[PDB]
Amino acid sequence: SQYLRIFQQPRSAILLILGFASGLPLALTSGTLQAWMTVENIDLKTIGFFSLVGQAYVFKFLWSPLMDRYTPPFFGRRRGWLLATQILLLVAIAAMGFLEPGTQLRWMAALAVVIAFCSASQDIVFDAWKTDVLPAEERGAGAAISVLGYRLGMLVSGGLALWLADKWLGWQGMYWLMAALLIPCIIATLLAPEPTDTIPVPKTLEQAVVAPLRDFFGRNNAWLILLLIVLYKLGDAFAMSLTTTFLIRGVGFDAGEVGVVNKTLGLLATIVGALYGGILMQRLSLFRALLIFGILQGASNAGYWLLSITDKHLYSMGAAVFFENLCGGMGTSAFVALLMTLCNKSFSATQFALLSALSAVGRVYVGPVAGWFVEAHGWSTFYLFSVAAAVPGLILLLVCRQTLEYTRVNDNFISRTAYPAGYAFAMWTLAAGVSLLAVWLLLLTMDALDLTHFSFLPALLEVGVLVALSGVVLGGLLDYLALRK
Numbered sequence: 001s002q003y004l005r006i007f008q009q010p011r012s013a014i015l016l017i018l019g020f021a022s023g024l025p026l027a028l029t030s031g032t033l034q035a036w037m038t039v040e041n042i043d044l045k046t047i048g049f050f051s052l053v054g055q056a057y058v059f060k061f062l063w064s065p066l067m068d069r070y071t072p073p074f075f076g077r078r079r080g081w082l083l084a085t086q087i088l089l090l091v092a093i094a095a096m097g098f099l100e101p102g103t104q105l106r107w108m109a110a111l112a113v114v115i116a117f118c119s120a121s122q123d124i125v126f127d128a129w130k131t132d133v134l135p136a137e138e139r140g141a142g143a144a145i146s147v148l149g150y151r152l153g154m155l156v157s158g159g160l161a162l163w164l165a166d167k168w169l170g171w172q173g174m175y176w177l178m179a180a181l182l183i184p185c186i187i188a189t190l191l192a193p194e195p196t197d198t199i200p201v202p203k204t205l206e207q208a209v210v211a212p213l214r215d216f217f218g219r220n221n222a223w224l225i226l227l228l229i230v231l232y233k234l235g236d237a238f239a240m241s242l243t244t245t246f247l248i249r250g251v252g253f254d255a256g257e258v259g260v261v262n263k264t265l266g267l268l269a270t271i272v273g274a275l276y277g278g279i280l281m282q283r284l285s286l287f288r289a290l291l292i293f294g295i296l297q298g299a300s301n302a303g304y305w306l307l308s309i310t311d312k313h314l315y316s317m318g319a320a321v322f323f324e325n326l327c328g329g330m331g332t333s334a335f336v337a338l339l340m341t342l343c344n345k346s347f348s349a350t351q352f353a354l355l356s357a358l359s360a361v362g363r364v365y366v367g368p369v370a371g372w373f374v375e376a377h378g379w380s381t382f383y384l385f386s387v388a389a390a391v392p393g394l395i396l397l398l399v400c401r402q403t404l405e406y407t408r409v410n411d412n413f414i415s416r417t418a419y420p421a422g423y424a425f426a427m428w429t430l431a432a433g434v435s436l437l438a439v440w441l442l443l444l445t446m447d448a449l450d451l452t453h454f455s456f457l458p459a460l461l462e463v464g465v466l467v468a469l470s471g472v473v474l475g476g477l478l479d480y481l482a483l484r485k
């Protein structure tokens with residue numbers, strides 16, 4: 001009853017519809033396309049242009065500040081951009097089908113790049129719309145319903161699309177149908193609620209760029225929260241990186257069985273776990289849910305440790321995969337809720353995109369290290385290390401209880417006034433490190449244009465990441481000292 005009420009309310013359907021519209025764009029630019037172009041034997045000539053469509057989704061934060069300042073002529077900051085980024089995908093996705101892959105491959109690639117760029121903006125504005133309107137109690141269930149819509153969109157965009165195209169309809173008509181299925185999405189955008197008009201908006205574009213950073217870094221506890229955001233998901237990334245390879249080699253299973261088992265059980269478990277986490281969060285506070293969910297996520301992948309020693313069996317694999325996926329989808333909703341709470345209403349999506357990118361910066365480094373650890377200590381000890389690698393996230397969450405308990409009851413963050421002498425040094429060092437990484441990115445994009453070549457590529461990135469880590473460590477230590485005193 002009280003746990004059930006959330007589903008009947010009409011805004012839930014709008015959230016799901018707007019979620020499915022994010023998926024239909026993701027697979028009509030990289031995956032169904034190649035399947036279409038396999039008739040024309042996609043070459044290496046167009047990959048130079050085609051390298052950007054995958055890249056728009058990773059680098060969305062840089063063009064994000066433009067979204068908050070600007071507004072469409074009518075409809076307010078967050079319900080006008082969704083009408084503008086859901087009318088452009090429709091004019092391009094259908095048209096793209098008008099082209100012929102015989103002699104217009106470059107035009108097709110350029111249209112794919114434009115479609116990806118539009119989808120990135122729609123995604124960021126939709127995240128801002130989610131964070132602005134949703135109240136304090138229902139955030140987890142909203143995130144779960146959005147994830148369910150996302151998955152139901154990706155599945156329709158790939159599977160049923162391929163089946164229809166190669167059975168009845170044809171490729172051009174499959175593209176036409178994937179274009180025409182966006183009309184309900186724009187209807188839902190038009191009929192959805194809006195953020196209030198009380199909240200102020202930045203007056204200058206440079207102000208839009210600079211204000212969110214000064215607002216987030218002028219908090220009582222900022223560096224500790226940054227460290228928690230970075231280090232929450234390590235214990236899941238480590239196991240998810242090589243679970244498939246372990247199930248292939250260390251146990252003795254076949255590729256098809258592993259693929260099928262993942263492709264069904266992982267989806268079902270993730271969906272059920274996310275919805276359960278949202279329903280339970282609807283009545284439970286943020287900190288207790290975060291702690292319990294983190295402990296469960298850390299203790300989940302001991303099933304893999306049990307599997308590694310014991311001999312092969314189908315049901316053991318099924319149970320372990322089901323449990324791991326349920327615990328992961330269970331904690332992902334709590335993490336999304338924690339990300340959503342911190343940002344303030346006025347500058348929402350810039351502070352959401354930067355935090356989301358900082359969340360995913362963890363997966364880049366763990367990859368090669370996961371490779372080295374296996375040859376060092378066998379398959380089995382790797383998973384014990386995975387179990388023990390979730391301790392820092394729980395410890396940081398335990399230390400940072402005060403701010404999360406105060407925010408729920410006061411709905412605002414206390415400004416920083418303790419130890420004002422040492423924060424400037426850390427901020428300046430972090431700025432210098434980010435500037436160094438920007439210089440490295442400029443060097444990489446200068447080299448990739450074949451205008452010139454540089455021999456200083458990896459060392460600059462290593463130095464910059466070392467400087468950034470040192471700055472964040474100094475900030476965290478100073479914050480801990482201030483909290484103790």
Ligand SMILES: CCCCCCCC/C=C/CCCCCCCC(=O)OC[C@H](COP(=O)(O)OCCN)OC(=O)CCCCCCC/C=C/CCCCCCCC
Pocket residue numbers: 048051052055059062063066084085088114117118121445448449
């Ligand atoms: C409804 C609103 C929609 C808003 C967005 C619409 C965008 C439509 C079209 C945009 C085309 C943008 C072209 C930019 C060209 C200049 C930049 C460039 O060439 O960067 C290259 C460089 C490296 O590319 P490769 O060499 O292929 O990488 C190889 C890696 N191994 O690119 C990158 O590093 C990342 C990609 C670019 C990220 C975004 C750059 C900034 C934004 C550009 C366009 C968005 C609008 C900006 C202006 C807004 C105000 C008018």
Ligand SMILES: CCCCCCCCCCCCO[C@@H]1O[C@H](CO)[C@@H](O[C@H]2O[C@H](CO)[C@@H](O)[C@H](O)[C@H]2O)[C@H](O)[C@H]1O
Pocket residue numbers: 022057058119120123354356357358360361362364
């Ligand atoms: C200094 C700023 C922060 C660091 C910037 C450089 C590192 C960026 C993070 C590491 C690279 C991976 O970055 C991450 O890529 C995945 C790729 O699917 C993106 O994935 C995204 O997929 C779709 C895109 O519409 C979203 O619905 C989803 O929520 C999101 O995760 C993330 O938005 C991005 O953050």
